[PDB]
């Protein structure tokens, strides 16, 4: 009866004024921190887009989302999709973000189940995954932290999205005696 379900959806408000941001890259750790950036300030929601760009091996990606009731009155209607992040990510096919699995999407990808003694999930605020040494095809996937239904003092929150764009990296098959095969990972 209980089962894993798939879902669709990109936005709930007008767009094309996305306000892109790059991720904060601390030398191998790429971070999208939404703690102060989604608090309700302007009347009406403002979509904010963090952009992670990966063209090198073993990049850790950390995404921080504030919790429901983490601070009083500011996150009473926060939502995060997908719920099983980072095991489930959002991918765009028909301009709708449909739920797909990250281990099918990049082959050989490993997800630690505990980020820092707490569960690797948005229930604990922060998700975190490390990309493998070789990715063979370019891949884009998405996460959403929607505070745009929270309203305090007649001001609505923000819809933050994370776009992880992985370029192909890892080099050619030959002249890589370590990742080639016949004895290897």
């Amino acid at each position, epitope marked *: 009866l209980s089962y894993e379900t798939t879902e669709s959806g990109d936005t709930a408000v007008s767009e094309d004024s996305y*306000d*892109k*941001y*790059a*991720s*904060q*890259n601390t030398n191998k750790e790429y*971070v*999208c*921190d*939404f*703690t*102060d*950036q989604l*608090k*309700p*300030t*302007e009347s009406g929601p403002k979509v*904010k887009k*963090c952009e992670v760009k990966v063209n090198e091996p073993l990049i850790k990606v950390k995404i921080i989302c504030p919790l429901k009731g983490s*601070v009083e009155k*500011l996150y009473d209607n926060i939502e995060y999709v997908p719920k099983k992040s980072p095991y489930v990510v959002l991918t765009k096919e028909e301009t709708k973000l449909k739920e797909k699995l990250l281990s099918k999407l990049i082959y050989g990808l490993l997800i630690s189940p505990t980020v820092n003694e707490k569960e690797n999930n948005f229930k604990e605020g922060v998700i975190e995954f490390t990309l493998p040494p070789v990715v063979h095809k370019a891949t884009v996937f998405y996460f959403i932290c929607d505070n745009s239904k929270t309203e305090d003092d007649n001001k609505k929150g923000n819809r933050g999205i994370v776009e992880v764009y992985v370029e192909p990296y890892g080099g050619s098959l030959k002249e890589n005696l370590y990742f080639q095969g016949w004895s290897h990972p």
Partner: antibody
Amino acid sequence: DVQLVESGGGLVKPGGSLRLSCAASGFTFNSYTMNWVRQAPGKGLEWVSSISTNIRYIYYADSVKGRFTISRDNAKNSLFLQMDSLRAEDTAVYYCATIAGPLSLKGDFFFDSWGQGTLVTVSP
Amino acid sequence: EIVMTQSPATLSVSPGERATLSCRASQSVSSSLAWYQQKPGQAPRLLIHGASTRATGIPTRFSGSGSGTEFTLTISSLQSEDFAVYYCQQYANWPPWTFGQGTKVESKR
């Protein structure tokens, strides 16, 4: 000996255009986010525009976007602001300013060094 | 856009005494605040970043404190150089980076 020399200010009638430049010296120019901040006579500081070390994330003030255009030349150590279709509100002294590091979603976006500004007067 | 209200409007204080300035924010900025000094006719000088981390080349009499909504810049023993206008700036919820409207400290004689 960090130096930021602004140039290009002056008097323009409303609707006209102007191009401010900022020649910098004394630091590695390609690893700094460049910014323009204006100050009306007697009034406070107002940020107008910014460009990251990666020339993809450019940000404008809400009142000036669609009129202003920021640009960067890393080889000449120069920063540019084209101001077109100027209204009367834009009369101010314009300061060239630096932020250490690239422009991210969060963290440490304060103005490390400033220039001496140039006056832009919009009046008919 | 969250507004930064500075208090007081003008502050008259004798040299050698202590001056505390208050920056108040509409929404929490959570330690993403900077203080700048502007002597008249000059460019602003960065004083304190991070709301308690003194910038390099800044006198020790300047000190920053505060969280979320309320911040204070304190000059403990005031000198002649420090008579200027002082601005607070948040960099947490952006665009835009918004400034306060300034606090003029004047030499009481």
